[model samples]
Structure formats: C-alpha cells, structure tokens
Target chain A: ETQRILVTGGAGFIGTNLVNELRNRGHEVLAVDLMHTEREDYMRADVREYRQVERIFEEDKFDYVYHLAAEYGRWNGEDYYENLWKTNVIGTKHMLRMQEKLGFRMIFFSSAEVYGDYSGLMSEDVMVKNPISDTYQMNDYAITKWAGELMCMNSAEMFGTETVRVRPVNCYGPHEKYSPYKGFIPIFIYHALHRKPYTVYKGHKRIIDYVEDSVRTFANIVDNFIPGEVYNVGGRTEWEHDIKEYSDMVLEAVGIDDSIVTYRESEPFTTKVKTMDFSKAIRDLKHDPQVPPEEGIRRTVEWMKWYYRI
Target chain B: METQRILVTGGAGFIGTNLVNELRNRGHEVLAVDLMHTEREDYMRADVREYRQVERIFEEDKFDYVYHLAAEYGRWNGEDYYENLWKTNVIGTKHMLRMQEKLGFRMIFFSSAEVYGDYSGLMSEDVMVKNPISDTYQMNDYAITKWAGELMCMNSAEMFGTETVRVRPVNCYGPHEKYSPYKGFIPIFIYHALHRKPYTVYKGHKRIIDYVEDSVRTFANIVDNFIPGEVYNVGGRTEWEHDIKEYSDMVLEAVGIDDSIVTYRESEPFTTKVKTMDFSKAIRDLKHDPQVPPEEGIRRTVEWMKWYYRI
Candidate 1:
C-alpha cells in the first residue's frame, strides 16, 4: 500500500486534481506549492512560511498531508483581509506545527462555509451541535474555515495530532484559475468561456461537486484513515440547483447566449440554500458522483476552451 | 448622573493595571488603550493588531464601556510566539470586534480560564453550551486563541447587534503582576523565590488565584451591571483551591527561601489536572467578591516582589 504523500494546494484546483488522484493511486506524490511550478513532484512552499513549512519537513518524510492550502473565495476573503488571516489562520498554524512534529496524518481543507446562515440538514453535527456563537459564520471565508477546524480540534486535543477535516461542497472543475473571487462554478464557467459579463443570484441554492467527484472523496482519505473524523464532501442532495439552474448550465456548456446573462434576485451575504449531508461521505469515503452538471459543465467548458486560447 | 466614558484594552497589563485603577477610583472617565507608551495621564497608544490602530480610536473617543484587556499571554507564550499568538489573540480580537460593530460600545470581553480546556467538570459558563469538540478539551494555542476571542465576540453579537461581556480570567495574581516566566504560579513563585532561582513545582496541579484588588474589583463590576450574552468564571472562591506544592510552599514562606530552590514536578503532561472553577457565575453576575487569601495573597505577592526587585 504505497504512501508518502504531501499535497498542500499542490498546484491548485482541488490541489491539481488531488495531486493527480494521489499519483494515479500508486501514491508517492509531492506537490507543495505557492505556485512556482516546474511540475514533476512540484514543491515551492509557503504555508505562510514556518521556515517554508519547516523546510518541507526538513526535506521529505510525509505519510499523508493534503492541507490544500488556503485563501480562496468569499470575496477572496473580503478583499485580502491580511492574506485572509495569514493564509487561512496562520497557514493553519503551520499545518498544526507539522502535525505536531511529523506524526503526520492530516487532510484538513474545510469549508461548507462552516454552515453559516444555518437552516438545517447540513449535518456533520452542525459543527458539533452549534458549538456556540450562533454558528452564523457568514464569511471571513466562513470564519477562516471555522478557524481551521478549530486548529484541527486543538491539535487533536493537544498533540495526539492525527487530523481529517474536509468540507468542500461547491468544488467546480479543471484547474480552477480565474479569480474575481471564484466559484459560481468558476465564475459561471469563466464568463461563459469569455464572452464576459456575469451575475446570477436568482434566489441562491447550490451543491456543485465535480473536481473529479471531489478528488475521489479526497483520495479516499488515504484509504479510510479517519482519526477525529469530519466529512461533508459534496454533491447529491438531489443535486440541488437554482442560481438560474447553474446559469442555465453555464449557458448550455458555453455555446453561450442569454446575452452574457445577468439575473439577480437575492444576493447579500449569500447562503440561501446549502443543504449538505453527504451521508458521512457516503458511509465513509466511497462518495461516488460521476460528473453531471451536464457532464461537469461540459468538462468545465472544454477546459475553459483550451484554457483561454478560446 | 453622567461621567461614564470608559475603555481599557490591556491598558498596560496586569489586569490592565488593576482595571485602570478601579476605573479611576470610580468617578469614571478612563481611557488607557495600550501597546505601552506613556506619560501616564490616562494613557493612549494603540495596537489591537492594527485596523487603523483600532480604527483611529473609535474615530477619536466616545465610549460608554469597553474593557477588552488585550492578550498574547501564556501556554509557553502560545507555543513560543505563534505569530504573536495569532496576531495578538485572533487578529487582536478582530480589531475589537470591528470596533464593537461600528462603535455601539459595551464590550468587556477578556476571555481566559484557558477556555476551560480539559474539562473534568464544574468549570461552568455551561461548558460553552454542553461541550462539542468531542466533549471539552482545548490544551493550547493559548486555549484556542482564547476560544477564538470568545467566538469573535459571539460573532459580533450575532451579526451586529453588538453588546458584549465575556470574562474568564481565573488564575489572576496580585500587585501589578510583573515577574513573567510566563506569569501565574503567583508570579513565577514570587519571582523564583525572590531570585534564589530554580523553580518547577507541578505536583498534582490545581488553581484559582485571583487577587489583583480582588480580581479588579470583579473587573470593575462589569460597568455596573452591563450584561449581554454574559459569560463568567472570574475566580478565587471555590474554597481557594491549592496544590502545586501548596503554592510552592507559599512561595517559600514568603521568599525567605527554602525548599532548596525546588523542582518537585509530576502532574504536567498537557496540563489541566484540576481547575474546577465556577465563581458562581462571577457571584451572581460580576458582583463577585473574594477578599484576598492564599496566605495573604502570597504575602502580598512577596511585598510586591521585594519592592519590585530592589530587594
């Protein structure tokens, strides 16, 4: 059972397809990232620099780590609120101080906007039964992913270390790189593959999962590892829609029309419908989705029309 | 009947210098915000992790009450400076909960008792609504950034209705607590038994110190009863609990020194061996009283650590 992983936002978009589905399931991956890629087993480093993530764990030795780095969305965390609290809360306290000094087993990611604007059936014990402050966490990117899952449950009740968080939910496809604070499925499939001009609040409601079905339930949590578990990985609540049905399925997979769409009717602090409950990642990480927002918005509109060569 | 303007953000430490000298001996018109710079006369310097220096002091003063007692204290100074303990305890309590949501003041949020971490019971404040992260346990990152500055002051009092009040305190000691070897244990056992040095007690932990003028006169009686989503546990009257070598033998019988520079160790692994606090809801809401006792509060903190180390 090959292992040795480490994918901290390993070159973006569901961490470059969960580091190529954990190196095509043979495992020995690398990918670190702060984006300065040469590729093959990447690794630049900047989990908000704890001596560059302790010099990549003093030059390699990881069994599993997929932190999926941070600072994504919710108005790019209200217009860069200090690089969104130093890359999602002091870069998740330097990956819980290297998972309390290399006893690695982390996963972490986190965010179904920590169920803010809570209105039932999100589950995963609605943040362990409303762990106070009326869980209406509406932004600061869901309160820095619920303060990095409460510093990974306070480093698993103080240094027993092993983590496993994942929240996901609206995880669109292809190397998601557009910006202007992404997701409304890659800002309506990269503005209908570039005939720009977007907006589609029509009484929000979402559940979009397809980053190869949420990184195959995040590389099936390193083969069902589950320590201090927490999963809500998305899609399948009868595949909820309506944000003008995914902007008319991204203008019918970007053949475009509805004249560069614009249909607002409700959008303020968002959350009108989240409705999660991935049946505990489908009874523990067998969470199957097999892409269908009309074939993952026609493969994220033909990979943003050959990544913007249009 | 008016002179009530207040504001005391860690006004120069030690329970903000005895709660700004008991709210300036009760005539009230205090100011003290601190990052410490001063010619004293009602101090000013700001630094609540900068939001235009905590929004240009509420666009230049107009308080009715705010006592935030700033932080970055203990637990190995939050594991040796966790980026100044999450930029002064969660972005300095999110710039005082975004200036108490655009200046409606009425805060009083210090939050500590290490947010009752290893809960073995009785540390009240409804153990923050019947435990969650698998039944109570925090154990550092300075008690999860003082429970993330009391959940960003109850998420800005439920998305801006703002009106805070969340104290926790507990192991508070007396006489402008100085000697920091990361404080408490009554000022690092009366400044290492008045400089004879060597310290480290631990023998079956247990605390409940409180004394800075009996916990800053119950933290300046929470601006004379300003309760709003209240939470307290102020400390020092759960039968003045002891053990930790009975307060390092009352700091070596008031620092005349003895237990041979001590080192008794034992109950310390990930701390919280016993901290059964409950200050009975800070004695029915901030009127909490506790006339000094811990052998006369470590003999008046060893006469203020021997006249503050001039011995």
Candidate 2:
C-alpha cells in the first residue's frame, strides 16, 4: 500500500536518507523537522509545541507517523535535559495523542540505548545493565532516547495505540554532516581529504551501519512488523571494527595510506563497546546490510568529495 | 483529680455537647462554644477558611487543651463540595494548628473514616488512600474535611513542635446528635422528625453506640490523663436499640408531649448514615467510657429535659 508517512527529523543524516528513499518509492511523505536551514522540502515545525504539532495533523491526514526528531547532544548541560525531555518525551507524547485522534499507526525511531549496555550477548530480553562507566554515564542522549522509547511503550499499552519501535545502532553514510559529535565517517573523511591526520582514542571498537541499509531495515519492519515489537537494525557482525582499524579503512577509501593516521594513548574508550547481535533483524525483518564496511566507506568518501568539491 | 480544663468547639452539637457535659462533671472547667443561632450552629462558620472564629481562640491562653470537632455535616455537590471542604476541613484545621502552636498544648481533633471512604471499612494507620472518588459517590463535604483535617494534623505535627493526634471515628450516635437530619439516630427517628409524627422501628437494634457522655469521658481522660501523640477511638455500649417505638416514647417524654399530639409525614433525609462503634483502642488507651447503655441514657435525657422545661 502507498503509505502517507509523516517523517520527523527528515533533514538529519538518517532521516534525510529515509525521506529520499520513501519519496523515491512514490509514497506521500509529510516531513516535520526543526532544521530551519536551506532545506525547504522539510516542513519547519518544532515538535516541542503541541499547537504546531496539532496544526500539522489538522492540515493533513497521516496514515503513519515516524517520530524521529529529538534533542541530539549528549554533553550539553542541564538545560539540554529540559530541552530533550520537552522535545523528545513531551513531543512524542503529543504525537502519540495526535496519532490516536487520527487513528494512524506509528513507527517510533528509538535507539539501542534503551537496552543500555549489555553485559552478555545482547538480546531484546536482557535487562538493561547499569551504566557504570564514564562514557555511558556521559551520554544523556542515550538515557533520554531510552526514556522516549519507554514513553512510546507506555502510550501504546495504555491508549491502545499501534506502535513499532526501531532501535538502530551507529548509523553512518553519505549526506552525513562533518560535525564533531555526529557522523564519524564524514568527519574523518573531511580530515583525510585535507591531509590532516585524525587522532584515534584508545583503539575504541564500534559497529558502524550504513544509513541507507539502516533506513531500509526500518522501512521493512514498519511495513511488515507487528505493533509493540522492537527491532534492532544495523550492519552485519563483520562490519564491527576498532577505531584505529576503521580510520585506516577510511584513509584507504580516500586513497591515503595508514601512515597519515595518528594514535592517542588516552583513557580507554569511556563506554564498554560490543558488537550488536543483528540476527533478530535478519530473521524477522530480513534486514541484511548489503554494503560492507570498506565499500560503505568508499561510497561515503566519494560522496563527500563530490558534495564538498574537494 | 485537679481536672484539666479543655475547650470544646461545637459543644452544643452531639459529640461536643456530650464531651462538654462529661468534662464539666469530671471537674474539668470546660469552655464550650456552640455557634447557637436559631437552635442550629450550621451557619456560624460558613467558610472554615475564614480566620475570624479561629482568631477568637487566641484572646485567652487559658485552654490547656483543645478538641476541634466543628464542621459542616451533609452531602454536597459541585463547587459547593470544594467550598465546604475548604471551609470545614482546611480552614478549620489551619486555625486549630495556628492556635495550638501559640497556646502550646496537646490537641485532640476529630477526623472521620470517610477519609478512607473507599477503604471498604478496613483501614490501618499505615495505609494511604490515593484514589479519587467519582462525582456520583464522591465524598461530599465530610470526607474532604476529614482528610484535610488529618493532613493538617500531620503538617502541624511535623512543622511546629505541637503534638497532634487525629482520631478517625467510624460512626457516632447519642443524645444531641441530629436525629432529624439524615444521620446518626435511626431511620425511625428520622421518619418521625420529618413527618413531625410518632413512629417506631423494630429491627437492627443490636448496633453499637459511642454514647455522648462516653465521648466526653474519653476526652477528659485524654486531656489530663492520657499521653500525647496518641489517637484513641471513643466507643460506647454494643447493644443496639431494637425498639424504635421505645425511642419515640422517650422523645415524646423528653418534649413533654403525648404521643397522640405528634403528626407523621414522609420525606427522605439527605445524609447516608452508617454505624460503626468499635471502642477497643479507647478501652486499652483511655480506660473506655463507662458503658452507659443507650436505653438508660435516652430515658435519663428525656426525664432531665422534661423536668428542666417544667412541661
């Protein structure tokens, strides 16, 4: 069926890619985003205000809502907690209320942090471990995102609203902005293109997933998954690599040798890093990342070069 | 016993009147105040929140103790519920707390089980009732006042150095209790009062009574005799009043009117009344009110009133 999907945060890295994919599939997409940049296709509406969100519902009837917009920075101070709660928790609640009124199914884009850090092999059933490490504690972004996910679950159970939560991990790919806090690939690629050696901290290991593949998994689950279920979407197990190793891959993709990279013996990666178990995604959503790490990096580097004209 | 003086507000009303008489007889100089206007104190303190009557309490610091038992007694609806609750429960409690703080004495306040109205009649000190009552069976003004009264006790106990204990009475009945209104007494009395006629009830006479005199006796015991930081229930004899006809006879005797002079009419009373007179705690703590059987008390009241009026 042709879905009238309202994608929030449609201008962000993953959201932009998701919007382009859905639009290409000939689906009617009404995107709500706070990105008031030169991006005109995405609607300039802040979800924090209930009236503005209500206005969107009044203007158009949505078949499904993809709630993706949220305050992003983890290290921002106490005001960030307030802002994140207002935008993510309160905003999501407002959207859920609107969806109930409109009778639309909702696809809530949650993060894997709701699981927190898993001690054993991570599964949906494992209790979220206490964030004992500095890195885990430092990430308010994860805590708020997890809180938002729980809010979705509560709303769904209490209000009888149909919702599917998608927990995507470390999504990175093309159209990624070169910001210090986000999109490591694009930032690293930007540094590489400028012949500036990027510093790798503690050979930190992380699993990187291509944004397009992640979005495809999200779309697939939203299309075929059951309500009240959470699907973890990300790259394959082989895509997991250390920061030094991943940086080498990025340098190679940019045709720069390993010699251009510098290693910093700083404190260990503040967070306990583990490769995600995506077998459930493969089994349930049939989501398999088609683009490997090296190939995805090459695509990302090529796209950045062309986009930045470097 | 150099009896301890205690002030009882609403002393002309059922519980207050009974307590005042008992305290005075027990050698306690009881200062009693009943907003006795037109034989009814109901309109005296329209709003419990108003500080006027409360301020009057501060004029003399002679009261070693206080029993705050004044409140509007009836079921109310809509905004009147809020108003009545604020007046009787909230304001009444605030005034007592402030006065007691200034006077510095142990205060025994009357609370009701209606605060735990939803408790299905099984409540303990530890339990908290958080459920909001529906508008249909919402607590009316009584529950709000009782709950707010208890909260004020708690707040004052914590905030100031005043020792306050709140006692929640389930149901109380005795002489001076408004038998004409929808509560206490019995349906037969209510029927008689409404129709201005004579009637009698035959069944359910085995109910309990925390007789007015006993309630007063309990208060006197608590004032000079009992420890602080304690809540004790004042219950009376358990034997129920089985003969409504007998109660009617007593009422007629009290009024010095023959049974034939009364007229009977029919109109339902507004209060939904129930009776629960458990006095175990009262017995253990304050040496329970000497059991004055309801029949005997009724007889004595009728005889006394008739002699006093010379009818």
Candidate 3:
C-alpha cells in the first residue's frame, strides 16, 4: 500500500549513488548518517548509538533497508581501531538488532576484501580470511570490512530469513571518492586533470563500474536478493588492462601522456589480486550492467571536469 | 626476581597521571602510554584504539601488570560521548583482555563508582542481590559503561584465569581531578569557591567524594594486594548527608571566602535513587584504607588549585 524504504549510510559515496537512483525512480526513501554533507536530505544519527537506531525502528516503517554504514579509519592514528570496532563491528550488531526488530529484508554493503588474496572468479561461499594473523592479507579498510562480513553471515544464526550481503569490488562511479587519495579511478582523473605525476600499484585486475550502472543494477536486484545469502555485485565484464594501459586510457580521456605516469611496487597491505564472479548476483537478482568501460571513463572525466568546473 | 615491568594506559589523564607517578615512585619500571605526548623520554604516545599499536606495546616487552585506566571519560570529553562509551567500555576492554590473555599480564582494570548509580539503599561491591537493574542505573551512561567494563574484566578473570583485578573509585577529587559541566562535583565546587562564584546545591543533594591520592594509592597497591577475579570499591569517610552548608563551609574555610557565596537552590530532584556506598570490602581485600578526611581533602585541593593557577 506504501512505497517506503530506509537506506542507512545514504549520505556516503555509494549511498549518494543509491539515494540518487531511488529519487529518480520516484520511490519513498529515508537516508540516515552521522554526518550529512548536505549531499542529499538525510536524518543525521550515528549508527553506533543504539538509541538512534532503536528510535528509528520504533518510529519508521520500511519495506527495504540498504545497510551501508562503515568506518574507513585507515591507520592514520586518527581514532582508528575503535572507529572500526564501534562502526563496523558494533554498528553492524546494532543494524542486525534493529533489522530483527523491524522484520524487513535488507542488503548489507560488504566489500570484496573479505576474500583476501583469493584471486580470479570470487564466489559467495569463499571462507573469510583474517589478514592480521597472516592467513590472508589486508589493509585497515579491508580488515574492518571482513569483520563486518562475518557479522552479516552470523546474523543467519540470529535474524533467520531476512538479509543478504552485496560484496562490491572497486565499484566506482560519480560521487565515488576512490582516487589516489581514496580509490584508484578518481586518482587517475585527479592526475590527468593536473598532468601531475601518477604512480600506480602494480598487479590486480579490477572490475570498476560506473556508479550509474551499479546503482541502477542493484535497484532492480534488491527485490530478489535472497535473504541469509551473499551476492558478489560487480560489472558483467571484468577488465584485463595493465597499469600502463590503464594510465594511457585515462590519459587519453584527459588528453595527457607517459611523461607523467609510472608504476610502483605493491603496498605492504596489498592482496596482489582479487575479483568477484557476479554470476550469482545476475542469476538471482536479474542484474545487467550495460555501461561499457569507455562510456564509464568518459562519464567520469566529464564529471571530474564539472567537479573542477574545468 | 619476579618481573617488575608494568604498563599503564591513560598515563596522562587524571588518575593515570597520579598512578604513573606512584608506580615510578614504588620502584616499578613503568611504561606510560597515552595519545598525548606531553613529555619526551618519560612516556610513549599510543592511542588504545588501534590493536596493532597496542599489540606493538605488548610485543615490546613482557609486562607484569597492565593498569588499564584509559577511557573517554568526563562530561565534557569524547569526540562523541555515546560512541566512545560503547567502544572504550565494552569493545576496548575486549581488546585489552585479548592482548593480556596472549601476553600473560595481570590486568588491573579501573572501573568507576558510577556503576552503583541510583541503585537504591546501601551500595556495595559485594553482590548482595542481583536484580535486572533498577531505573536510574538504566539511564546513567557513565554507570552503564563502568558496569560493562567491570563485567568484561571479571569475565576475563574467570574464563582465561588472566589474573584481572577490578577497582571502582567514587567522585575522585585532588590536584588532578576532572572538571566538567554535568559531573565532577568536587573539582568544579573548588572552581566556584576560588572564583567566589555562588556554589549551587539542590535540596537533599548528597556527595560522597574521594580524595585523588587515596584513589591512586589503592590502584598502585592493587597489583600485589588485590585478589584476582575480585573488585574493590574505594571511597572515603564522606557520606550522603543533606549538608550543602557543610560542603560549602568546608570549601569556604579551605579558602579565605565565607559561606556567603554558597546558595542552596530549590531541592534538586532525581536524587531519590541515591545510595551511600560501602567500602569495608575494599579495605579488607585490597588494603585500600583511605585516610584523608573531606576537610583535609578540601584544603589539599584548594592549595593545589592555587599552585595550578599560579595565583
């Protein structure tokens, strides 16, 4: 009788993408986050605060929830681990608790980081890895993501029959802050924009997506997301371009060259290589990613131009 | 010889500063760690939030004891109060216990008297009767955090035989007492006194403040004196008396000002759940016999304030 949905972490990078999709589709949505950059209208509440989640549960009604809150406190000595614990671990616990309270099917935004270095076609049934103990490899960001993934998986033992995990790998699009400062794609655009020197970490074939395609893909898939399950959500076609080739592509898009690009050894926390097989997501959620890498990069450069008003 | 290397977190905070000083004085090799880097060569800068940073501290040496006094406490502090309350109270303890279990260090976790908040009638560390929890304790965030920390500490002692000692101190006041808007009664009272500002007390308000020296002394001795898997609730002779005048008179007498600046406002409500706590068990168990009377404590704090302000 009503079109109601709650998207937690809706003011975030992926969140903005989700909110932008829902608004264009004319669906009722409420976005929640601790800090809203006025990116879109949002109810500002920290998920770590139980009372905030509890109050929302007691007051609001929703048919769907996109639980996406997480701490990206990457070892800068900036309230780092507690940020991971309170948000990723404790925050996930709160989401599960409130989700159980509301009895709504939800999709938890997990990361491809959970698989560690398990290269080539990644699947949902892959065992989670602990990088801190050296069984696998990780960074501060991935370590927290894997912990959050476990919480989602174990929720089956608790919240029986009401959620699925969408583990995305390098899903880039507009509002995606993945640059050298954040993620891979945007940093390339940043370097190309200034004709600045760019250093790429060698290894790993990434399935980068246009935010438009992935958001639209998920909006169509949300209804069919099997509860108590995992879906590797990504692009249909994976990229095999080397670092030099990637640099040339972005450079061509920005109209620049190799005088500014070089490849470096992988960072200590690098998994070397990882990608997911989204056949499960497609088979279950009826997903289709139609945006070509050329079109995606073209749209990204145009947005980066608009972002700098160049 | 038994190893004497001890690790103290929050070594720059109120109780932590005192605990560090006392530990060093007692001839224990104390490694003071906190996020603050006030002094070089004396303490190391490490935020307890990061496990790798903490694990580095554990791996650096074999510590005989870990005095975990670090917390995002005080009414005015915490980047976000409730967030830190959950992290520092429950999850942070989990981190420390995990590290301690691996390193085999006896832990002395400093909880607080706020855990006994508004639990009607006489409050004691001895579990007299465990109810699900009464009303006031339900709303007090500080109380809940301390109680959760205590539970985590005791659980570690029981499950892992980790030799954890828990201490709960009430309303600590002395040179390094915390000042705040919502709590820290005595610390701010001294502020009001030194400023000649009116000391406001609600009707039927009672304070059971502990001197800071007494609090730290108990903590310094907790390693050797306390029984593992046990708790110590340390306080002084201060009791819950409806004597706004008595406390005001003490502060006035401590300084040159008279009780003319003291104002007893309309009786403060929501204090019906107050309990004058017990410390007999602390005295018997941890040799935690606090000797300073509140009057002497008042004089000591006033003098310390004068020195602190350099006035």
Candidate 4:
C-alpha cells in the first residue's frame, strides 16, 4: 500500500536510494537531511534539534518515518563521540517525541554493529536474551544503537507508539561515497580506484548487503508494520567472505592488484565473523537479496568510476 | 578504612548534602561539586554536564572515590526539559566514566529504582539481567537515562577495566529534599501540606520510602566495602511498604492538617503501580539498616520543610 513517508538522512547513500525507490513505488515522500539540497520534496532539518524536527512534523504529517540519520562507524564514534551520541541517541529521541505527538509509524535504522562480539549466529533475539551487562565489549556506536532500540520500545510501552527497528548489515553499493569513516567496501573501492595503499585484515569474515535489496525491505516495513519488532536485514549467510576475499573482489572490479594492499591479521576491537540470520526479514518483509558480492562490487566500482570521473 | 579523599558530584543537592556531611563526619577528606556556587570551604562549583569542569576537578585533586549523584530526576521533569535531563544524566555520567577510565579511581554511580521500570516482580537488580523486555521497561527518559548510565559503567568496566558500583535508591526522602512539584510523593506531600497548598494522591500506587539519614549511612559504608561491578537496591525494608493515600495522610498528620487540601485519585497513566524492591544486598554489603519508619521520616521532613520554608 502506498503511504506518505519521511526519510531522515534522506541524502545519504541508502536513504537516497530508499527515497527514490519509495517514490517509484507510488508513495508520497519527503526527504529531510542535515545538508541543504534543492531536491524536490526535500527539507533541511537537524534531528538533534527538537524544534527543527517539530517544525517538520507540524508542517506535514507522515504515515511513516525512515530514521536513517546517525553518526556511523566505530572509529568515527571514538573520535567524534559527541556527535555520535547527540545524533544517534538524542536525535532518535527527538524523532520518537515527534512520532508520539504526530502518531506516525517509524522505521528506526539501527546497525548490525549492535550485535557486538556475540560469536553466535546473529539474530534479533540476541539483544533480548543477553542484556546490557553482557554487551560490555561493544563500542559507543553499538551502545548508541542498542540504546536507540530501547528508546523505541520504551516509547511504545509508555505512549503506544508503533515503530520497527532494522539492524542493517554491511550495506554497500552505488551512491555510497568514499571516506575513511565509511565501510570497507567503499573504502576498498575508492582506494583501489585511486591506486592508494589500504590495509586488509585477514581472518575476519563479513556479509555485505547491496543497498538496493536492503532498502526494498526497509520500504516494505510500511506494508506490514510490527510494533517493537526488530529485524536483521543483510545478505544471505552463504555470501560471507574473509576480509581479503572482499579486498580481492574490489581490486578485480577496479582493475588493480595487491600492490596497493597491505596485508595484516584481524583488526582489534572488531568482530571476526558476523554471520547474520536474515530469515525473519525474508519471511516478513519479503527480503530477496539479488545482488551478490562480486557483481555488486563491479557495479559499485563502475558507479564510483563514473561519479569520481576516473 | 583510613580517611579516603572522595569527590561527590551534585554535592549541593539533597542526597549530596547528606552523603557529603556523613562522609566528612566519618573523618574522610570530602569535596562536593555542583552547579550551585557557595563560599563553603568543602563545596566547589562545577557542573558535571561540562566535561571540562569535571576534568578540572580531577586534575586539581586526586579523589580516591567519586560519588556521581548529579542527575535530572523525575519522569515529568524529563518530559518537560529533556535537554537538561540528557545532558546532565547521560553526558554527565559519561564525563565521570571517562575520568574513571583515565584516572583509575573507583566510582559509585547513583542510579534510581525507576530503572526497574514496569517490572511487576520483586526488583532485585538481576531482574534486568534475567529477563529483558517481558518484565523491565524503562517507562520514561529519566529511567532510560539512568539505566543507560549503568550500562555505560558496565561497558567501561569490560572495555577499559574501570571499577564501579551502581546503587538504585528507592523512593528516598526526608530532610534536605526541597519540595519540587515533580519530586517524590513524600517531599511533594510534605511541602504542599506545610504551605497549606493542595496536592493529589494516587490511592492505587505503593512504594517504600527510605529516609535520607538511613540511606546515606549505607551509602557511606560503600567506601569501606567497595565491590566493583556490583549493583545494590538501597531502600527501606520490604515490610515498610505503604500506599499513596496512607503516605499523604502521614504528611497531613505531621503537618497538623486535614483532608481539606488533599485530592485522592487513581494511579496515573505511564506510572508503575507497585515497585517491590529487595534491599538484601545492601543490608549484607552496605550495612543498610533503615532505623526510621515512614511516620518518623515524614515528620522529620515536615519539620525541615517548615523551618526551611519559614512557615
């Protein structure tokens, strides 16, 4: 069913794609971003400021809100934790408050990083069973997302607000710009395209979901909205690869070699194997991951080449 | 224990006054920091929300133990002004955790019984750990922030090896608690009764109110028996539970008033009706033995409010 929607961080990678796809699916959409942009149906608002978010909700009511805005990455959190907590924790609180007042169903974008150092098959139930004390090894980024999910549940219990939390795996594809703070996929592709040196840690295995497939499920939450339910949306378990394997695919896609790659052991303070269970998303949201790593990497590299004019 | 150098954040607050006074009386070198600046020799002015200010305190003096008691208390207070609530409670606690991580000083984080949330069973600190969403629900931003502080403490302990003890004070009242409309029922009832103002009482709700003197005495015992990674529910005895209307009546009795200024109502929405807490841990470890009953404590608080308010 088509519905009115607002996508926070609407200019970012997955947000831009999700906004486009939702519009393509015949939904009324407004894209709110921290950056000033001239895109149609777009507004500039900082979620950290309640009045800014309040003004948006007052202007036009949405049927759903895709809260994708947050300070991402572990190292980024450590370096700029003030922004991390404000944007992730307090910013989400602002949105929750608006949802409570405006009565809009929300799709809260959490990260798979919330499943920190849990060496089992990653599922949404892990958060419920393990509790906070067990999640002591997590970084501030993970803690913030877990805290965000708790806030959503708290609001639901307190105010009967309906919201769903989605913990996205390593989602990468076109529209993902390169930065040192970004995921390994874009960093690898950007580094390889520029023929710059980058370190690759072995022993770590990860499954990176292509953004197009993941955003479809994120958009599909509107059709069957389950209040207080969390889902892990990512690539299939079979697509898991060692860190060097993904590096090799990126190198192949960019027509480069291992000359620019610095080989190393596993990274510190990072989980080694993040084998996620996406069966719940597949069942509920009709999640079908069509793009695999090799094809996705080539497509991403092609887009980077065109975008960066390499 | 020998005299330990202790730094009490929010030292000018009600609980802070009792804790600081008791700690100093026990022959410990104590410094109390808060937003309120005064000319008192033991009291220094510093806001815990500001990391620079918190950093300056630790830089100037080496505190053996820090009692981080500063927080925006109450549910409606959090709803009305969340910016101050979050900044003071979450970020302020983070500042202390950061200091503990760097300086290696043991800390006692003051959480609240509100963290038990809507858990219907007896809240024994492990209730949060044993059961997740089914039982414990942090119903407000205040409860969420307090629990977040506890989680941050646990995270720091695991990640950086920082030592901390968390105490959840349950319905703590008595002298030094100034009457805020949003504060606990005892203080609110007593203050309103003293001033001959009207107050509402929820007849359905039940709670255990601990006097500040009794609570602080147990809190002071933590410096001697400091156990890292331990959580204690510090409150009145389980048998001392009282209904809301009974508490209001006690306030009226203490203030020499009648039901003329009182309005009785059912339990408010989004408020927990029954908060049955287990303070056995505090009894064994913290020597937490409440000597004052609700009647005694309520009268004591009434006297303080009458004198403080000059009524």
Q: Rank by TM-score, descending?
A: 4, 3, 2, 1
Clash-forming residue pairs, model 4: none
Winner on DockQ (1 vs 2): 1
TM-score of chain B of 1: 0.34
TM-score of 3: 0.54
Q: Which model, 3 or 4, shows the larger TM-score? A: 4
All DockQ scores: 0.12, 0.02, 0.05, 0.41
RMSD of 2: 16.2
Best by DockQ: 4
Docking quality of model 4: it rates as acceptable
DockQ category of candidate 2: incorrect
Query: Which candidate, 2 or 3, would have the higher DockQ against the true structure?
Result: 3
- Candidate 4's error at B261, in angstroms? 4.2
Model 4, C-alpha of B310: deviation from truth (Å):
2.7
Model 3: runs farther than 4 Å from truth? A1-85, A88-310, B1-3, B75-80, B127-129, B178-183, B238-245, B259-263, B267-273
* Tens digits of per-residue lDDT for model 4, B1-311: 59999999989888999999999999999999989879899778888888899889987899899999998888889878888888898888888888998999999999999888777779888886766644665778888788878878887897789999999989999888888888877888887888898989988888998999999999999999999999999989999998998889898999998989998888878888899999989988998888998999988989998998999
Second chain TM-score, each model: 0.34, 0.69, 0.88, 0.98
Let me know the DockQ for model 2. 0.02
lDDT of 2 by residue, A35-58 (tens): 566654457778877788998888
* lDDT of candidate 4 at residue B236, scale 0 to 100: 92
Return the clash pairs for model 1, or none. Answer: none
* Model 4 per-residue lDDT tens digits across residues A94-124: 9988888889999999888877777778888
lDDT of 2 by residue, B1-311 (tens): 87676777766667777777777777877766655453542223222344576676556437777777776654333113333433445456666677787778778888765544333332333333222222112133455446545644654564466886667664455545544434544433533533456554443233344456666666667765556556655556434423434555555554455677444333223222333444566677777756666566665554443344343
